Design an enzyme around this catalytic site. Sequence first.
Site, mmCIF file in Angstrom:
data_model
loop_
_atom_site.group_PDB
_atom_site.id
_atom_site.type_symbol
_atom_site.label_atom_id
_atom_site.label_comp_id
_atom_site.label_asym_id
_atom_site.label_seq_id
_atom_site.Cartn_x
_atom_site.Cartn_y
_atom_site.Cartn_z
ATOM 1 C CB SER A 127 9.907 4.957 5.384
ATOM 2 O OG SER A 127 9.398 4.629 4.070
ATOM 3 C CE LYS A 141 13.579 5.708 8.071
ATOM 4 N NZ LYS A 141 13.085 6.072 6.473
ATOM 5 C CB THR A 142 11.103 11.268 6.802
ATOM 6 O OG1 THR A 142 12.659 9.916 5.545
ATOM 7 C CG2 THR A 142 12.760 12.407 6.843
ATOM 8 N N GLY A 143 8.888 9.630 6.287
ATOM 9 C CA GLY A 143 8.187 8.418 6.032
ATOM 10 C C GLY A 143 7.251 9.742 4.523
HETATM 11 C C1 LIG Z 1 8.895 5.597 2.958
HETATM 12 O O1 LIG Z 1 7.851 6.213 3.522
HETATM 13 N N1 LIG Z 1 9.026 5.044 1.671
HETATM 14 C C2 LIG Z 1 10.512 4.462 1.867
HETATM 15 C C3 LIG Z 1 11.765 5.039 0.205
HETATM 16 N N2 LIG Z 1 12.500 6.585 1.379
HETATM 17 O O2 LIG Z 1 11.142 6.767 1.908
HETATM 18 S S1 LIG Z 1 11.663 8.482 3.204
HETATM 19 O O3 LIG Z 1 12.465 9.417 2.336
HETATM 20 O O4 LIG Z 1 10.480 9.367 3.215
HETATM 21 O O5 LIG Z 1 12.327 7.759 3.719
HETATM 22 C C4 LIG Z 1 10.522 5.785 -0.749
HETATM 23 C C5 LIG Z 1 9.203 6.195 0.066
HETATM 24 C C6 LIG Z 1 8.283 5.466 0.717
HETATM 25 C C7 LIG Z 1 7.565 4.684 -0.244
HETATM 26 N N3 LIG Z 1 7.874 4.814 -1.260
HETATM 27 O O6 LIG Z 1 7.488 3.740 0.374
#
Ligand SMILES: *C(=O)N1C[C@H](NOS(=O)(=O)O)CC[C@H]1C(N)=O
Length: 241
Positions: A48, A186-188
């Site tokens: 993400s 931003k987290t991923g």
């Molecule tokens: C992104 O990495 N994703 C979308 C969603 N939120 O991620 S976050 O909390 O790191 O922003 C769920 C996890 C992940 C995905 N499974 O696509």
Amino acid sequence: TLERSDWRKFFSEFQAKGTIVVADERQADRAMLVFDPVRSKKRYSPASTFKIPHTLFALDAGAVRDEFQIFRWDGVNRGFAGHNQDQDLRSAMRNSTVWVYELFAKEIGDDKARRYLKKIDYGNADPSTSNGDYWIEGSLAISAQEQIAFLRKLYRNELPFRVEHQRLVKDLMIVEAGRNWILRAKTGWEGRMGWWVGWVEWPTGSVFFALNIDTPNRMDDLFKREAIVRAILRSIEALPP
Ligand SMILES: *C(=O)N1C[C@H](NOS(=O)(=O)O)CC[C@H]1C(N)=O
Ligand SMILES: [Ca+2]
């Protein structure tokens, strides 16, 4: 880049294995700080964190007009609570609403993605995918050091997109601010490893960070992404106490 192996205490404080790159532009000529320099150069799926460049792609291609366009939800309970409702760019960024960017992906050319990724030299710039989305389940990969390089381009408005679109993305990244500081990040989460990338802007300059950790404990490890970075940033007076 200066190795800060003493930063192991911060990863151990939260029982994690990972890397972090920190580029401190406060004052001048400070060394780039790295825990685990080899892992800091290892490429991983951006997951993400790809919403940062993905939003630039979608704005540049016309998949989204601006921050006021509403994307109507199709009524299918497909993620978690914040995903199951109408979205704008800010809600999609804050909630990490995948189905908005899936919609952006199909509208953008599969060739456009390649031309985009290569024009910005993002990681390996390879959106080849076998099943899932190429930024989470595919060939696309980028290292922490490469994330820092990419974020600094965005910060300096040097990316080959309209400056208005770069500014909008940087505004969408805001997660917190005081009178004297602004945190954009931003987290991923890829499933087995996770990210937090971004920077914090101070009057005397900006502090960029890109961290990835393994996540063996799945959801219970997600808080560690921010927790490790915040402790490190606080240790260098890059976040308030
Ligand atoms: C992104 O990495 N994703 C979308 C969603 N939120 O991620 S976050 O909390 O790191 O922003 C769920 C996890 C992940 C995905 N499974 O696509
Ligand atoms: Ca400086």
